[PDB]
């Protein structure tokens, strides 16, 4: 199936790092960040992806969403990104899907730089208290399958046939997030690398993380939002 037109045309959709473009083709979107190098102000790494545009955006509770794909992920070991997210007005974030093959315990591996990722989410709860789960791991070259839904406030996360969700903390201004952000953090201390707002400092810090090779190809995509 092709990619949505929500996400191709730009009716839903702002594209963060514009070269390369992610559509590769009518049916793939495929997320490089170590070549888009996208960066933010507050941002702790590079990234490539798709968010919600201001304009769209209500609260969690005032929208039914649901995101689904095939999702490839290549990656050196080591590596970590956040690939579907749900974010706040402010800097704060309402839900998380990472690829990462660190050393932070509670999940399926666990264990820093050894080409395993552990796939896994946090949602932060009503309490705004992050709940997290292991949905499974993967090694560089793998597929799974990846969808999220925000039903009115609850929201739920499935991958490799493992599900969680619960109802999560409420934001006005809310928006979901995809693609390939990668964090610019050391596998094993889980130390934060770089400078905010400075791109040469992740240039740096993922080169110096041996993390040559990063990227996110997703397919079989959908999207629907029903906002009331
Ligand atoms: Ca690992």
Known sequence: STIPSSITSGSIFDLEGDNPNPLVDDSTLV?????????????????????????????????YEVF????????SDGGKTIISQHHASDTGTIS???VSDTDESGFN??????????????????????????????????????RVVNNYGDVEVTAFGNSFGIPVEDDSQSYFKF?????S?????????????????????FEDLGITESKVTMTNVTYTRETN
């Open 179 to 183: 693609g390939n952000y990668l964090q």
């Open 109 to 146: 591996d666990s264990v820093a730089n050894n080409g395993i990722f552990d796939v896994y989410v946090r949602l932060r709860n009503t309490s705004g208290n992050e709940e997290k789960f292991a949905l499974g791991t993967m090694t560089s070259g793998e597929t799974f399958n990846l």
């Open 185 to 205: 953090q050391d596998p094993y201390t889980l130390d934060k690398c770089g400078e905010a707002g400075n791109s040469n400092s992740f240039k740096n810090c």
């Open 31 to 63: 997320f490089v960040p170590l070549e888009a190098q996208h960066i933010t102000p507050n941002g702790n790494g590079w990234r490539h992806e798709y968010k919600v545009k201001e304009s769209l955006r209500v609260a969690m509770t005032q929208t």
């Open 96 to 98: 998380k899907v990472y």
């Open 68 to 75: 689904e794909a095939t999702v490839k992920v290549e990656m």
